[PDB]
Tab-separated table of C-alpha atoms in Angstrom:
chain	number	residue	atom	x	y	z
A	6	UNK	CA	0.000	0.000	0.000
A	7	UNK	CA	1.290	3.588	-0.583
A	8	UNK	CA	2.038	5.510	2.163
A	9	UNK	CA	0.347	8.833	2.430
A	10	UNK	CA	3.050	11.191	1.109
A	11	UNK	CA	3.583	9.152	-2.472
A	12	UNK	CA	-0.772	8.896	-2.766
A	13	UNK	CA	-0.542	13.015	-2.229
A	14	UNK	CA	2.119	13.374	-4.944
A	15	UNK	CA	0.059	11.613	-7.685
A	16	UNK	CA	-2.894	13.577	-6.193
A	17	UNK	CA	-1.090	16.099	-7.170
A	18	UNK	CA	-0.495	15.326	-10.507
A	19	UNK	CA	-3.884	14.516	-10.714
A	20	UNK	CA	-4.858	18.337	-10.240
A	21	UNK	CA	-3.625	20.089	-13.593
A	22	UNK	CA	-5.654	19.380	-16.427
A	23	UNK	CA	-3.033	19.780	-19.167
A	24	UNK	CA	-1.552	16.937	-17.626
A	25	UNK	CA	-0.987	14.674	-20.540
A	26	UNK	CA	-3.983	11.791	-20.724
A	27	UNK	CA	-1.677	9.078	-20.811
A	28	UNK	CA	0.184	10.100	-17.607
A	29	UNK	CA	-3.190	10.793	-16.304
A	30	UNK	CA	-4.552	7.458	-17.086
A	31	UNK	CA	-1.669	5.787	-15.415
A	32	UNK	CA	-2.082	7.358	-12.162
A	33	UNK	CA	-5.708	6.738	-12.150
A	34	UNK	CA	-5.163	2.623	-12.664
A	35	UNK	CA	-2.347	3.376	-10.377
A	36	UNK	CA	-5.073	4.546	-7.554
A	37	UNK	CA	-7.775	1.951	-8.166
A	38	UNK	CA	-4.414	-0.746	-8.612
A	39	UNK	CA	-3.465	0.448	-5.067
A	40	UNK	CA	-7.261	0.424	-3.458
A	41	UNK	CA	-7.291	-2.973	-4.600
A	42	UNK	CA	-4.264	-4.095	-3.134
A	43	UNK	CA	-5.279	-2.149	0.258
A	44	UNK	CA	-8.641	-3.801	0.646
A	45	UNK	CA	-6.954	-7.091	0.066
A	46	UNK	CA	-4.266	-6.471	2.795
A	47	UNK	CA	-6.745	-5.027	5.029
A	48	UNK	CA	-8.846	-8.279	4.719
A	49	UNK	CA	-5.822	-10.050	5.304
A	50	UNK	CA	-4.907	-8.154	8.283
A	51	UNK	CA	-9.152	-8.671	9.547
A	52	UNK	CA	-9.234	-12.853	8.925
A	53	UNK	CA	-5.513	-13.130	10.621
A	54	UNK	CA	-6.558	-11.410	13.466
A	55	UNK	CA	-9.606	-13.035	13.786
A	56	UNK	CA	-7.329	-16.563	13.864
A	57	UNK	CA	-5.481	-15.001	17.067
A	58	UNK	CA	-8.230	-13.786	18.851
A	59	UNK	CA	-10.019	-17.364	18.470
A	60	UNK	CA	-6.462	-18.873	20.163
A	61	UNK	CA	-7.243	-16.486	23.041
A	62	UNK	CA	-10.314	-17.684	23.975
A	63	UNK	CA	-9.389	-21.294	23.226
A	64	UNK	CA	-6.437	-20.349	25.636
A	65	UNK	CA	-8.862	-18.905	28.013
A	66	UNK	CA	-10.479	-21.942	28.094
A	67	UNK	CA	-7.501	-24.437	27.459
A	68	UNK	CA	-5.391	-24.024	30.264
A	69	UNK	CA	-8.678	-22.496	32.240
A	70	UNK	CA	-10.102	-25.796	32.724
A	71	UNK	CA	-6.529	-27.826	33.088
A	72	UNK	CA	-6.186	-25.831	36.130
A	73	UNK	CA	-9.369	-26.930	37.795
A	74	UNK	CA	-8.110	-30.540	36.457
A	75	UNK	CA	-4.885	-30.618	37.642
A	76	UNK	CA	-6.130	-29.615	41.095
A	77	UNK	CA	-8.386	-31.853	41.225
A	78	UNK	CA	-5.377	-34.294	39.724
A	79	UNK	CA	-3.461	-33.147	43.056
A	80	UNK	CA	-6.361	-33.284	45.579
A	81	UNK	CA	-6.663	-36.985	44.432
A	82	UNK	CA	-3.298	-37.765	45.434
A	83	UNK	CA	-3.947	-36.635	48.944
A	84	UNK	CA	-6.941	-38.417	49.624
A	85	UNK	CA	-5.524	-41.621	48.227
A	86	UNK	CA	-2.423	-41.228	50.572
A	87	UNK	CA	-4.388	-39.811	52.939
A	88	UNK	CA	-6.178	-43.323	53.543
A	89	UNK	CA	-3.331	-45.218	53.283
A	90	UNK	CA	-1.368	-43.071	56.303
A	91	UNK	CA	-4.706	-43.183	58.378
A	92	UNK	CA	-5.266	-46.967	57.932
A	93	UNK	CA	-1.326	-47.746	58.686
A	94	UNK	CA	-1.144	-45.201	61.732
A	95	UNK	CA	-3.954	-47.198	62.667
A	96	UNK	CA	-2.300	-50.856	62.769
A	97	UNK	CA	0.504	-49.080	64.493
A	98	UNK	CA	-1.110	-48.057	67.731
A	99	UNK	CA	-3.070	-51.171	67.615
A	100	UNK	CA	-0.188	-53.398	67.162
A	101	UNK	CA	1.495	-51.184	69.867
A	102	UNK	CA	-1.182	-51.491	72.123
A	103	UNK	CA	-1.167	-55.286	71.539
A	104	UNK	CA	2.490	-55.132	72.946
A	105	UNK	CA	1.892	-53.252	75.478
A	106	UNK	CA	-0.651	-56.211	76.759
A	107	UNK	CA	2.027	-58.603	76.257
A	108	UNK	CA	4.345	-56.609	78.451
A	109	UNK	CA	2.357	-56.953	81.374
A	110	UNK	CA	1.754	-60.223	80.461
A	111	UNK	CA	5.324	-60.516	80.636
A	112	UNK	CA	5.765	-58.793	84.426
A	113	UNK	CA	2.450	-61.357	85.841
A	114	UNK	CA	3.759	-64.299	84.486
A	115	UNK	CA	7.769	-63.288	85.938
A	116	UNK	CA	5.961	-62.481	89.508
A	117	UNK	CA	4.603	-65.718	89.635
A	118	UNK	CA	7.339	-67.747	88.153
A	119	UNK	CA	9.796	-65.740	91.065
A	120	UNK	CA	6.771	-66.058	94.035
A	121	UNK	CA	6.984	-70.162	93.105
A	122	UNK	CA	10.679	-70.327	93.061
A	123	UNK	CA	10.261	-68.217	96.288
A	124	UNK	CA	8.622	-71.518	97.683
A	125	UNK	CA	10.857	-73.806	96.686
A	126	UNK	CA	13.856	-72.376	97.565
A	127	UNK	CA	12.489	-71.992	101.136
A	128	UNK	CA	11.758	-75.855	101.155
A	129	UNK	CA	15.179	-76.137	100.116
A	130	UNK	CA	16.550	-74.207	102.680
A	131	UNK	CA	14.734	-76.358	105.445
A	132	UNK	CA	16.187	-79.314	103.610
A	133	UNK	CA	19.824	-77.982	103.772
A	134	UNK	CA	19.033	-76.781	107.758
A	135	UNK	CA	18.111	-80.627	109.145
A	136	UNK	CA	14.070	-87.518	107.797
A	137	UNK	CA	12.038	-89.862	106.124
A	138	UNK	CA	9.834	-87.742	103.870
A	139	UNK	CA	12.702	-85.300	103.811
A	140	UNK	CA	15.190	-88.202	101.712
A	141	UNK	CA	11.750	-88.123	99.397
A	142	UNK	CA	11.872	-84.663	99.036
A	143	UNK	CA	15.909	-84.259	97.666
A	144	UNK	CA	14.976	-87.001	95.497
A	145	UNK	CA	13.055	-84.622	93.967
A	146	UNK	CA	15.974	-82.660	93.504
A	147	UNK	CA	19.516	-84.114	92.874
B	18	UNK	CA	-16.228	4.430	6.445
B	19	UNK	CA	-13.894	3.711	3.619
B	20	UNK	CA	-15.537	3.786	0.253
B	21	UNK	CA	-16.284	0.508	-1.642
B	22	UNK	CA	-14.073	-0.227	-4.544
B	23	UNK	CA	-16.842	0.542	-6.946
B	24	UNK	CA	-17.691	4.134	-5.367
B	25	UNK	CA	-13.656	5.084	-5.765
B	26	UNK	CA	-13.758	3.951	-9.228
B	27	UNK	CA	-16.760	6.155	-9.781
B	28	UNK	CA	-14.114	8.586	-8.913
B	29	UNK	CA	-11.568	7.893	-10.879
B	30	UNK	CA	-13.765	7.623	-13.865
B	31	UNK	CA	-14.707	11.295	-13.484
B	32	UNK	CA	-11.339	12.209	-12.994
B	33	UNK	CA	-10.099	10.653	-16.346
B	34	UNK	CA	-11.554	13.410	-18.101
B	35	UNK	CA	-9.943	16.439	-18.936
B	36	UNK	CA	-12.815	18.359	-19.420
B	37	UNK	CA	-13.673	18.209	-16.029
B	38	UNK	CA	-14.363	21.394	-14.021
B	39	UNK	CA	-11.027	22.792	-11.967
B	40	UNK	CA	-13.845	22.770	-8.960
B	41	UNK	CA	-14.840	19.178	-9.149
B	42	UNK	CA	-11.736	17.691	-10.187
B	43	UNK	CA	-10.658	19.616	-6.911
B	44	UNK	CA	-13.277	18.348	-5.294
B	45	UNK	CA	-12.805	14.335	-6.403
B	46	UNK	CA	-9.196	14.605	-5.352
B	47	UNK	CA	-9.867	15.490	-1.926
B	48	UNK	CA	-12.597	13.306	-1.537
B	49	UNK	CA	-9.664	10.559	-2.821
B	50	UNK	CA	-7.530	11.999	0.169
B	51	UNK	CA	-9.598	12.370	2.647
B	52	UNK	CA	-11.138	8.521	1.920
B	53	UNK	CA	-7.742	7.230	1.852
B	54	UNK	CA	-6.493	8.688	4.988
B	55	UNK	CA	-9.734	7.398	7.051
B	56	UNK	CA	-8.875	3.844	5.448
B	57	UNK	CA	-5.225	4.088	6.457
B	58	UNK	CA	-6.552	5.113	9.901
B	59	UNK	CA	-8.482	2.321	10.188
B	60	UNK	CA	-6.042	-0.340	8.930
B	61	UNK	CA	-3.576	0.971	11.403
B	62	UNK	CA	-6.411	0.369	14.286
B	63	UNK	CA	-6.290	-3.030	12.645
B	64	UNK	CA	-2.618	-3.487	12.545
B	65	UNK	CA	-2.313	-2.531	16.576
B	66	UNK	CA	-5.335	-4.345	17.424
B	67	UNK	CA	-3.767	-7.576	15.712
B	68	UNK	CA	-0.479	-6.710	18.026
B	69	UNK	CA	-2.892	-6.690	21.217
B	70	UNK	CA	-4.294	-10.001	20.205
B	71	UNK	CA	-0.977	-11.962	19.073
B	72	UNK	CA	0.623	-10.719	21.962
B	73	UNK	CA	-2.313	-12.440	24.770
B	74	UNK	CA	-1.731	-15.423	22.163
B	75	UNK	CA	2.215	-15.315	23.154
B	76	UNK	CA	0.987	-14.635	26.685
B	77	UNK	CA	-0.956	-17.733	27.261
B	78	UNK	CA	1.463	-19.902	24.793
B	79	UNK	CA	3.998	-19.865	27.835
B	80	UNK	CA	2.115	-18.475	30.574
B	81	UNK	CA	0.327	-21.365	31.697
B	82	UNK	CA	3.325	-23.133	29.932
B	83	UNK	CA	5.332	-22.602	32.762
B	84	UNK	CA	2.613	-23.448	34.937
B	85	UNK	CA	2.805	-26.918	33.285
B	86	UNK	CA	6.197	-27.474	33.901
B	87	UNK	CA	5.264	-25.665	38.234
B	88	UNK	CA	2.538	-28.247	38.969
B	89	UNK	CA	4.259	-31.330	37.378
B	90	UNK	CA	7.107	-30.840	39.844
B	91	UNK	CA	4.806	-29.123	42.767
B	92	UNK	CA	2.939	-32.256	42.471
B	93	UNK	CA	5.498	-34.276	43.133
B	94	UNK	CA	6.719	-32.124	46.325
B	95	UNK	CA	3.447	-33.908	47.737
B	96	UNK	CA	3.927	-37.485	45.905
B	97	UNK	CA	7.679	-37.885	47.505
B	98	UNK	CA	6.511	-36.327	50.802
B	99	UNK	CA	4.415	-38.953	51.799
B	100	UNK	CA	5.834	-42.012	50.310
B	101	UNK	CA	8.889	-41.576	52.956
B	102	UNK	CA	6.496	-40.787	55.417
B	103	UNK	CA	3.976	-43.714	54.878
B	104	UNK	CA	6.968	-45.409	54.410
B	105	UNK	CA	8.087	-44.494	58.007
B	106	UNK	CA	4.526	-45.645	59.219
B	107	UNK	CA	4.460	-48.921	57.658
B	108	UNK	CA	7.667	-49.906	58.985
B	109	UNK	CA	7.026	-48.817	62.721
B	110	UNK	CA	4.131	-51.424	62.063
B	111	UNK	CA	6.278	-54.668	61.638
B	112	UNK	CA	9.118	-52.984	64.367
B	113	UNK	CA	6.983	-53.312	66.760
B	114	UNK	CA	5.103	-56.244	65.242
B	115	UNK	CA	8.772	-58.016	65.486
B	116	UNK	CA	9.492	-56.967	69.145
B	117	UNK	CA	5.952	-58.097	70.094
B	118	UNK	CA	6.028	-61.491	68.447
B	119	UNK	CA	9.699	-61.881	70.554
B	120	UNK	CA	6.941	-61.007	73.458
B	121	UNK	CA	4.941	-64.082	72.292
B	122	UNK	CA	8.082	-66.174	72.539
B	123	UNK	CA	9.021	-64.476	76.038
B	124	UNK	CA	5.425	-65.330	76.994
B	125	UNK	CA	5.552	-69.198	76.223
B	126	UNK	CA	8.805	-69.362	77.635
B	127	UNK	CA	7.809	-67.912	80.963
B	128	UNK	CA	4.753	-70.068	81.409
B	129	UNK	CA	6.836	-73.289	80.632
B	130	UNK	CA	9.079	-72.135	83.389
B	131	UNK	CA	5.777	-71.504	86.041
B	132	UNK	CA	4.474	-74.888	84.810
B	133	UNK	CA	7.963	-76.126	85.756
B	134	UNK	CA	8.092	-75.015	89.348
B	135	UNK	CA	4.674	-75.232	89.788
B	136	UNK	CA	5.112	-78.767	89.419
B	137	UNK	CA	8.073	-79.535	91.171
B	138	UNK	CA	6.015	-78.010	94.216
B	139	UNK	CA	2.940	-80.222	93.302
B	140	UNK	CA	5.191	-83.194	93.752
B	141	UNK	CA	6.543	-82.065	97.158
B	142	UNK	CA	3.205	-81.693	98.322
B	143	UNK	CA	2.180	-85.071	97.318
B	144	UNK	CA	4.658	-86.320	99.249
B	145	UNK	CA	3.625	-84.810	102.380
B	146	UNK	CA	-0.033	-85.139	101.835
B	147	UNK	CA	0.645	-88.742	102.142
B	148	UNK	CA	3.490	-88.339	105.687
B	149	UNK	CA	7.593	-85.305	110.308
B	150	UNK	CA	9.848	-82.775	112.342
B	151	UNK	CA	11.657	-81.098	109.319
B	152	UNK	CA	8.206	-81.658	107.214
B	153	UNK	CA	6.095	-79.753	109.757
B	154	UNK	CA	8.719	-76.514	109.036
B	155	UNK	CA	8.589	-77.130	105.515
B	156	UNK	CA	4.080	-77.310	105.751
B	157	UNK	CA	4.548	-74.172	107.770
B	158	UNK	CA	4.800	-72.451	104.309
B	159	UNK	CA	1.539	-73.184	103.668
């Protein structure tokens, strides 16, 4: 397209009448050449914008909606995880508690295994101290 | 605004004539400039308007672009968190699921020793059910 100042100068030209009809003719198809050529290009310029703007609503709704995905993509990932810490911290105070029972367990069944022994040794000190039973009793023992 | 392509070459028709009035031929020229600058306006709306559009276009192309790339890895920061902490879980589980089945083993171990003494004691006082100094100290315990 011609720029302003170069249209103006054929304008120009354009104005004296004893400008000679074949010049005159030329700039003429020159103008209606150049309107041509600047409707065209202006067309041009209207459909390729049109293309850009349609990218930024399909980006406006492209990466609109992945974000509402990928947090949902993300929130998904907690949960799961979620339930799996919850339902192993679970087995681990169970478990715990479990073996915590088996402690005392532990302690009742040592109090009676040294209360028994507790007996016994007293018999055996008796023994040890002094007849016919008694010969009985270390038989027991040896 | 601009004129249709047919209009301007209504123009230009009348100005091929050089019989034409100095007035009118005046008067076509300017209405050649003054059309031409409103259309050159307007395409340069055009042109800047395109350069608003392409450039939200080259916004979003690597705006959420980057955000791609940020939740991808931001994901992870959650995904690696909690598989060395479920990780952690899960193994205090079987730790103390290992000392408490050594518990089990302490447990049987104990009571074999009770049943042990238990019965050596049984036998002792079988033999004094049935029977006499010495065995009167050693009843004294019960």
């Amino acid at each position: 397209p011609l720029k302003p100042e170069e249209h103006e100068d054929i304008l120009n030209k354009l104005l004296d009448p004893e400008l000679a009809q074949s010049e005159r003719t030329e700039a003429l198809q020159q103008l209606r050449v150049n309107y041509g050529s600047f409707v065209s290009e202006y067309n041009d310029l209207t459909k390729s914008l049109s293309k850009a703007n349609s990218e930024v609503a399909q980006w406006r709704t492209k990466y609109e909606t992945d974000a509402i995905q990928r947090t949902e993509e993300l929130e998904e990932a907690k949960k799961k995880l979620a339930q799996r810490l919850q339902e192993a911290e679970e087995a681990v105070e169970a478990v715990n508690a479990k073996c915590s029972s088996l402690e005392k367990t532990k302690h009742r069944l040592q109090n009676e295994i040294d209360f028994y022994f507790g007996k016994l040794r007293n018999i055996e000190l008796i023994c040890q101290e002094n007849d016919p039973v008694l010969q009985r009793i270390v038989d027991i023992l040896y």
